[model samples]
Target chain A: RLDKSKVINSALELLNEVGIEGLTTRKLAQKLGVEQPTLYWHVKNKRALLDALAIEMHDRHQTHYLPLEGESWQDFLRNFAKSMRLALLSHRDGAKVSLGTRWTEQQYETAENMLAFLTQQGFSLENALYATDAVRVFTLGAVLLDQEQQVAKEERETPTPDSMPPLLRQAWELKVHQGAEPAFLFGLELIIAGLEKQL
Target chain B: LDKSKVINSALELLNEVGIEGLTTRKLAQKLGVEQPTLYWHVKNKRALLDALAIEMHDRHQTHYLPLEGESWQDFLRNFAKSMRLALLSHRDGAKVSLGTRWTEQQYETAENMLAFLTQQGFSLENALYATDAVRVFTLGAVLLDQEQQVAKEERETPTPDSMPPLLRQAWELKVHQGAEPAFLFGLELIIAGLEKQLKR
Candidate 1:
């Protein structure tokens, strides 16, 4: 019998070491000490295999959305955004994988939770829907940049100059390490603050 | 003499064929010249292509700051959003030019825009640091949006009714090509945040 866990683990190793571009069923089966046909038996094809990887990522990393009883929905949204970012960053190419996939149950649960949180805060259905898209776009978009920045830095050696742009340079410098919580808070607050004004 | 004209022509070629698959040999063939001749004019493939792409984009995109009324901050914010949208309009557009070397013309225009924003109200030092971060993030986000939309649309069948309602709705809105609204929303949100920061 094909062990799904073995296939998934092999895929993960292939992705981290060789990147998404190098992930193929042949290599995966080779890494797993199995026949290439065995991989097709387990995961169908490359696309299904990638989908499974994404689903596995979600299952492993998505935090349940139970909000604190007294916290404002705005706060709940911030926590949700941070959690999504963290979840995507947990795996190599996780941002690329998540952005590339069609929306799944995991993404839906996250959205439904956001919509419920906003509605609980008195947002109308339209507002809940609109804001849910807004937050998703903002967070996922930022995560994509986070990945690109890492990739680009790997490609170049010299530090990019201060001459680039002011506020942008400041933001880049602020990202001294992988810890994006501070900038995430700053950006999240900006969006939340804007929402507060509208409220 | 390695005229800038040749560089411009090369970039036009790049717009047709992206960075990964580009080759000077093909470029020279397109130009009806020997490959070595093209090499003699430019240092190497990367140098020729990078200079060409960056400079052409820089020339095409004029930098204009709407007259700073009493709400100069607001005007600057609008300017930034417009630039982001404009960048999105081209093929592999913003990502192709951004994060390349500073000498590149496209990189220069981006720098100039940031300077304009700093003059409006932002702290010079912080403005320098933050603008690139915002620009890079903005471009990356837009690319992600484009990729997601294309992938969803290319699927042979509907992505199952079970997909998230928001995503399903977004795809519906983009029945042909209307995902720009979502990107615009995020852009506006960032601009509003920038405005709030200036007020402080």
Candidate 2:
């Protein structure tokens, strides 16, 4: 009647409602139309549930870039970073879920494949790891940095003109109201350019 | 007795239990008080965590200041290193700071840094991203590097013998360093990349 997939999927829907600290096995089970023991049979406990939640989140994100090909290494890395940012940014505290969860062989295998993939593009294995990690940390950092600060809605609503001193005020007037994508792309290119020099 | 006092103890509890295991009840017990009394002061878990993170920022506030006429790159590097060390000071430090709202001082400092960069001819748009880019990289670098929170069972299973030369040698190389090299490499990459943009 119950399965890991069914349970973890419900937990993610729950994740956005409660954020990370509020997620609990008790609440998760009730949402699944089952009691604690039943959900426990699947995920084992809260921390284990979080680990499964983290993996499923990654799995969902990796779906977009399937059959990976046709792009140059630069383009592929660029695409990979963008998709990852969107994936993690899609949820509340998504960056925290990704970063806070422990690493598993699931990620390990993916890393191995990524290293092999980049080597096919001519980087030595170590440099391959370096570039991938640089992109990763930068991408993850950007998501966390760019995510909505967890302040209450009322407090955050006032990015009013009054909320400034000097150039910060000028910044508000001069700025284009764009998505985080352009800046993300800007930083992404920075690394890509830096990497190109290394090669 | 109040939110401030309650938060101080809560932060100490955070150092011991890290984030996952923390709760109002446990924090209350640690405070030698009951639930209603604790609730009256700090309200709930979310507020408590928010206070802890704000305090962490206040403690690390000095390093964020801009020195007179330092190059923008050096200011960012100093910003990167200080923010990195500040987050590293506690258990799950990155997770705490990453998920919370900015403190008042942080908002002021962002303006300060903005003043510095625009003074140096950075377009406002690029200047904003430059600061955020450092944050994105630094917070990200800390999270990946913040691995000590794992219990033995939670860490990556030992690198299997069948692991390819690519994974194993890379793993072996990484074991010799405790995350700074990767961190600095990423920082320099961003710095160099941003510097390249200065010519535009």
Candidate 3:
């Protein structure tokens, strides 16, 4: 009765708990009550399991077409960026997991939807291509930063004066919101405006 | 005597091995010395490694107003972006390297320069804040992208049930310069938005 679906489910659970580093075939086999050989029979190796996990995570945040049409390319691109940010920001180290993998089927779907949106809004294929690439870099980069913030939380204690980045001290010391979403939105607007000039 | 040579050698090794996988034992092996000998010159592994990383990447552009034609706003922001890019391009990831900073000397230098530009009438305080926000965003994004790029390159191409449609199409058109263009677009957007705000 053991199957790939069962194996994948177990792997996903382990990924959420232990992260990519801790997820191994032996640990997975132990958790699933299956022998190491049985787990390998289903997925082959740890890399394969990580690949599956990446795809599955991508599915959760895969971009889709926006039903409401935007009046302008700027509006459309901003909205697209927002949705992508939300999707990647949803999980623990979601962005890190995302960045760690190659172009997934879901990521491709996101690009296609973005291109379609842009081309419809009067952008040429080249502009659309460039724009999508920029968004990907920004989102992937933002998520990675977000993940680092999360990881830093788990470290033993506060970093000392010597260890801290000096200029950021005041900013880091200030009490504030986690503010990732606003920062992303703010950057999205800037990007849209920049792209608008090209048009 | 272990001097700059030991530190530079260690940095070179970092580019080759990475932060997570490196160890003092391995570093000493590369240096052709007894493991304990490294301790004689430096306090311990983390201290030596952290100091080496910071020393290797502390240069920020000299403080000045951008030339008359170039907007100081843009120049300052671009400088921050360049610094991040340089770090990301290095080994062990820039953010990882930033984590071990003993002092904020490099960051303080960059900030002072940025503040000087703002003083010269680039933008208002809030706008300057926005500019700094984008700068952080750019660095954070680039660092993550570098980490992911390395990780992805090490593994096989993932087989998603279906690729993200737009990305899949971009591949067909052969416009995929990987994620570079996408990163540029976002950076441009932030810049544009800031420009608009300045006019307001």
Local distance difference test, each candidate: 0.62, 0.75, 0.61
Judged by lDDT against the true structure, how good is candidate 2?
0.75
Chain B alone, TM-score of each model? 0.70, 0.85, 0.67
Give the candidate number with the greatest TM-score: 2
After superposition, the stretches of candidate 2 with alpha carbons farther than 4 Å from their true spots are: A16-19, A25-42, A63-67, A101-109, A148-160, A172-176, B1-10, B17-62, B99-109, B151-156
Most accurate candidate by DockQ? 2
Question: What is the descending DockQ order?
Answer: 2, 3, 1
Stretches of candidate 1 exceeding 4 Å from the true structure: A63-71, A105-110, A146-184, B1-19, B23-49, B52-56, B59-81, B104-115, B118-120, B125-137, B153-156, B159-177
What's the i-RMS for candidate 1 in angstroms? Answer: 4.5
DockQ of 3: 0.37
User: Residue by residue across A1-199, what tens digits does model 2's lDDT show?
Assistant: 9988889888889998999779889999889889888887887766677778767877888723322666778887888888878778777777667765644665666667767778887887767878988887888777776563434423333455665666666655554367667778888998998777667
Which candidate number would show the highest lDDT if scored against the true structure? 2
lDDT of 2 by residue, B1-200 (tens): 77777878888899889877788999999999999998877676666766777777678862566787778889888888888888887887877776564345457876877877877788888887787788878888877777534633553456557566677777776887758887887788878888888878
Predicted candidate 1 versus true structure: per-residue lDDT over A57-166, tens digit per residue: 76677643547788777877787677777877887877666666655555677656655676677765455554555665566666665566555655545555565455
* CAPRI-style docking class of model 2 based on DockQ: acceptable
Could you give the DockQ of candidate 1?
0.34
Better of 1 and 3 by DockQ: 3
